Design a protein around this nucleic acid. Structure first.
Ligand SMILES: [Mg+2]
Ligand SMILES: [Mg+2]
Ligand SMILES: [Mg+2]
Ligand SMILES: [Mg+2]
Ligand SMILES: [Mg+2]
Ligand SMILES: [Mg+2]
Ligand SMILES: [Mg+2]
Ligand SMILES: [Mg+2]
Ligand SMILES: [Mg+2]
Ligand SMILES: [Mg+2]
Ligand SMILES: [Mg+2]
Ligand SMILES: [Mg+2]
Ligand SMILES: [Mg+2]
Ligand SMILES: [Mg+2]
Ligand SMILES: [Mg+2]
Ligand SMILES: [Mg+2]
Ligand SMILES: [Mg+2]
Ligand SMILES: [Mg+2]
Ligand SMILES: [Mg+2]
Ligand SMILES: [Mg+2]
Ligand SMILES: [Mg+2]
Ligand SMILES: [Mg+2]
Ligand SMILES: [Mg+2]
Ligand SMILES: [Mg+2]
Ligand SMILES: [Mg+2]
Ligand SMILES: [Mg+2]
Ligand SMILES: [Mg+2]
Ligand SMILES: [Mg+2]
Ligand SMILES: [Mg+2]
Ligand SMILES: [Mg+2]
Ligand SMILES: [Mg+2]
Ligand SMILES: [Mg+2]
Ligand SMILES: [Mg+2]
Ligand SMILES: [Mg+2]
Ligand SMILES: [Mg+2]
Ligand SMILES: [Mg+2]
Ligand SMILES: [Zn+2]
Lengths: 117, 63, 95, 272, 87
RNA sequence: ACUGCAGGGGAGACUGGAAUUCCUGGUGUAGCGGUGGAAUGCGCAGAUAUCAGGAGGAACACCGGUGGCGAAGGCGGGUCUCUGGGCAGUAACUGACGCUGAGGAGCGAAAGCGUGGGGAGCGAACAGGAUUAGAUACCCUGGUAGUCCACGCCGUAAACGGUGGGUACUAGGUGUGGGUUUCCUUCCUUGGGAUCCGUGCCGUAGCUAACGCAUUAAGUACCCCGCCUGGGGAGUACGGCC
């Protein structure tokens, strides 16, 4: 039982999963359905189909709380990074602007060693 | 190179009007090959931009 | 004595009136040691490119002194120790 | 700063000693000296309440000024850095401009001849004493008061310092040498800088007699006692104690701070 | 360091004829001044190996020059040793 | 010597922001994480996600290159202080003062060692999961020393251009860094030419077993030094020095 007409959509799309969270413009979360929350598991969580399913779930759960328009912030080297936006669009929401907020260090912390697979 | 072409045009960390160019839309220093500066004036521009960022006349990252 | 150029950012809560007399003491600490103070230009409030000490504004001042290195080190130590100063940046106008 | 003895005898093989290079005027100030006598760890009943004490060289107390309240605005000059048997830090004799002699704990970098100020209008230099309101955050301080006017209690050992974290409304946050975050009134006072003689912990006392001089008597392990004397006593050979380790009075190891002490409101984080 | 005038006091005091800058005596005096100054620099900054190497090169050059002046005129060599220092 | 010039050359002090981790609080609910596929693991006692505040360490995106500096190892966040070398011009000065260099001395990546401090991330050893016939591994989840700092030691690397130093000479073509310089001096072109010092590619003579090198020689000559004498045993034993 809330009512936030305008909100923000954060889409974190990694190589292993995707998480969509809907917040008010102040950073308080409304709904957050993710790829594992939708029925999926394992390596299927990285497929674009799972991403768009999670986007639909989150969009409708937020509409139930009263959101009509969301600004989009995407980050991560994922594959559902655009399919989630398309599902947010064609699940009853208008997005408008889209931002890229992938964190970029200024040559800071040492990364883990390269996989010898 | 503009600074070689016309001399006595000082590069300084306080001249934000001149430093607005040579920085990309996201605030990154433009490459040397796309501005045509010589090596020495490219170094001067990079130094001025770094000092301006540090002293907060320019953003570190205009995300 | 070398030419130095000190630029200062001050707390925006300060009014742009008492700023000129406030730094006169930090100028007298140079004048006693035997330096010169040429231009004390003030820029006034400007919006900083980013949050410095939870202040989106600040007063920019350029000191433009010419004195001995130990004197300038004493000056900027005193400024950084002062509470109304946000940032200090000392440079040499020559090489 | 630490001088190492040559291995001339078995008792001086690994031993070491201060060089005493910071010490001037090897004699004390006659009017600031009070007598002491040893107590052997005996209380008013004449019974041993603290074990392993007694013996040791005769000492004379030197009056250290831990308040520094009545001389605000009066400057002082450091005259001498002297030895003090009652603490690990050296002490400095101050000549106030009004003509008063005082000892303070010598900070790090307080060479003889420097000038020392007190009060809210003093510079942030080693040896200056200010209320916590006047000290900028991120500064190393020592000899901090717990209550306004109570005297310096924290960070008095050699090499110690307290790192001032920040002042919120009327309370300052301090990281004490043990590493725990405490909160104190901003009207408390502290001296700017770190306590000197920071290298004294590297001293290797060579022999048992050298500790007897400092006044420590030998310590007997409880596992080589009899069961009547210590809970660890008994056994046919040598044992580990037939139980979990305990004190000589049967108290088990574990936290001994009072759980509902009145000062919990001022403790942000316990030490690690 | 050794600003122009700073070298000038040394050249006036140790050169030969009012314009002498390359004689062994003038060169040895200048090298000695540089060596001294770099030595006070190196008393602080114990780990400036890259400048200690420059000190070593200056010392070597001064040793060649002292050897040369000793070979060419022992009286000049002795006077210069007494004016500056040896061992 | 004077006058200019370029530079991540070195040391010390102070200082900046992005990001990772953790802590405190708000929102919020069931997953997150990870893989070729999984499991161990974290979470439901409120995680991941998201917002605000704080602590702390380490490394410095864009500039950035094939490019610069250094004897080599190596050197890039900024500012200040101190300090070494190089190049060009002048031709003012000295007048062969040069070259090399047995032994010797100094410097010398990383790992490692001692004493003290610090510890975000990474990560030998170690533990669990997975794969496998087995898996003391590769892959995954954790994780100590270490990596960092101060002060010493160690003295080794495919420490490489697998090419010791100095000097002179022997077609050119075409990039790029630092100067000077007439003329074309505006042909504004900061272009062309000439000269000096670097750093690349391609090519003639010449050399080479060949590959290739080729004015930065592996060519033509002279000076000094180090080293080689079939493969193993072996850069090992014994002796000695550290
Ligand atoms: Mg009694
Ligand atoms: Mg005891
Ligand atoms: Mg015992
Ligand atoms: Mg017994
Ligand atoms: Mg008994
Ligand atoms: Mg008993
Ligand atoms: Mg027992
Ligand atoms: Mg027994
Ligand atoms: Mg037994
Ligand atoms: Mg035991
Ligand atoms: Mg250092
Ligand atoms: Mg942590
Ligand atoms: Mg939380
Ligand atoms: Mg979080
Ligand atoms: Mg002549
Ligand atoms: Mg040689
Ligand atoms: Mg040799
Ligand atoms: Mg060494
Ligand atoms: Mg190492
Ligand atoms: Mg170690
Ligand atoms: Mg070991
Ligand atoms: Mg240690
Ligand atoms: Mg790891
Ligand atoms: Mg691992
Ligand atoms: Mg295992
Ligand atoms: Mg070898
Ligand atoms: Mg190498
Ligand atoms: Mg070899
Ligand atoms: Mg050669
Ligand atoms: Mg040769
Ligand atoms: Mg060329
Ligand atoms: Mg042959
Ligand atoms: Mg070729
Ligand atoms: Mg050959
Ligand atoms: Mg051997
Ligand atoms: Mg042997
Ligand atoms: Zn230019």
């Amino acid at each position: 039982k809330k009512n936030v007409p305008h909100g923000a959509a954060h889409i974190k799309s990694t190589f292993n999963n995707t998480i969509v969270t809907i917040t008010d413009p102040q950073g308080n979360v409304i709904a957050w359905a993710s790829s594992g929350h939708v029925g999926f598991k394992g390596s299927r969580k990285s497929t674009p189909f799972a991403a768009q399913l999670a986007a639909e779930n989150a969009a409708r759960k937020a509409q139930d709380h009263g959101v009509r328009k969301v600004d989009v912030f995407v980050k991560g080297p994922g594959s559902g990074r655009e399919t989630a936006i398309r599902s947010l669009q064609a699940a009853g929401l208008e997005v408008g602007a889209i931002s890229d907020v992938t964190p970029q260090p200024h040559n800071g912390v040492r990364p883990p060693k390269r996989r010898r697979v | 190179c503009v600074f070689c072409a016309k001399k006595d045009q000082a590069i300084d960390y306080k001249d934000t009007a001149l430093l607005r160019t040579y920085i990309s839309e996201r605030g990154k220093i433009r490459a040397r090959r796309v501005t045509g500066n010589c090596v020495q004036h490219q170094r001067d521009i990079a130094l001025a931009v770094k000092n301006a960022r540090e002293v907060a006349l320019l953003p570190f990252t205009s995300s | 004595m070398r030419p130095y150029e000190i630029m200062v950012i001050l707390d925006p809560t300060l009014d742009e009136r008492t700023v000129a007399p406030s730094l006169e003491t930090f100028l007298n600490v140079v004048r006693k040691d035997g330096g010169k103070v040429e231009k004390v230009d003030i820029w006034g409030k400007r919006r900083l490119a980013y949050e410095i000490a939870k202040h989106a504004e600040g007063i920019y001042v350029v000191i433009d002194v010419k004195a001995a290195p130990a004197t300038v080190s004493e000056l900027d130590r005193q400024l950084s120790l002062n509470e109304s100063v946000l940032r200090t940046k000392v440079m040499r106008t020559d090489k | 700063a630490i001088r190492k003895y040559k291995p001339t005898t078995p008792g001086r093989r690994g031993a070491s000693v201060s060089d005493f290079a910071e010490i001037t005027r090897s004699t004390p100030e006659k009017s600031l000296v009070r007598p002491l006598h040893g107590r052997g760890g005996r209380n008013a009943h004449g019974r041993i309440t603290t074990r392993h004490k007694g013996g040791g060289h005769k000492r004379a107390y030197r009056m250290i000024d831990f308040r520094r309240n009545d001389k605000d605005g009066v400057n002082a000059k450091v005259a001498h850095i002297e030895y003090d048997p009652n603490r690990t830090a050296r002490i400095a004799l101050l000549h106030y401009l009004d003509g008063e002699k005082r000892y303070i704990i010598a900070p790090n970098g307080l060479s003889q001849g420097d000038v020392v100020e007190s009060g809210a209008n003093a510079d942030i230099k080693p040896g200056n004493n200010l209320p916590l309101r006047n000290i900028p955050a991120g500064t190393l301080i020592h000899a901090v008061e717990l209550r306004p006017g109570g005297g310096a209690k924290l960070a008095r050992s050699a090499g110690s310092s307290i790192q001032l974290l920040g002042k919120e409304a009327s309370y300052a946050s301090l990281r004490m040498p043990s590493g725990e975050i405490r909160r104190v009134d901003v009207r408390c006072r502290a001296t700017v800088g770190e306590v000197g003689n920071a290298e004294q912990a590297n001293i290797n006392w060579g022999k048992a007699g050298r500790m007897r001089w400092k006044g420590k008597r030998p310590s007997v392990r409880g596992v080589v006692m009899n069961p009547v004397d210590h809970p660890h006593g008994g056994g046919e050979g040598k044992t580990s104690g037939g139980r979990h380790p305990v004190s000589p009075w049967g108290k088990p190891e574990g936290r001994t701070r009072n759980a509902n002490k009145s000062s919990n409101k001022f403790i942000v984080r316990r030490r690690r | 360091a050794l600003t122009a005038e700073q070298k000038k006091e040394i050249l006036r005091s140790y050169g030969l004829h009012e314009t002498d800058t390359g004689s062994p005596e003038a060169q040895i005096a200048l090298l000695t001044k540089r060596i001294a100054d770099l030595t006070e620099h190196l008393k602080v900054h114990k780990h400036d190996h890259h400048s200690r190497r420059g000190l070593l090169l200056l010392v070597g050059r001064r040793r060649r020059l002292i050897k040369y002046i000793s070979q060419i005129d022992v009286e000049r060599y002795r006077s210069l040793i007494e004016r500056l220092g040896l061992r």
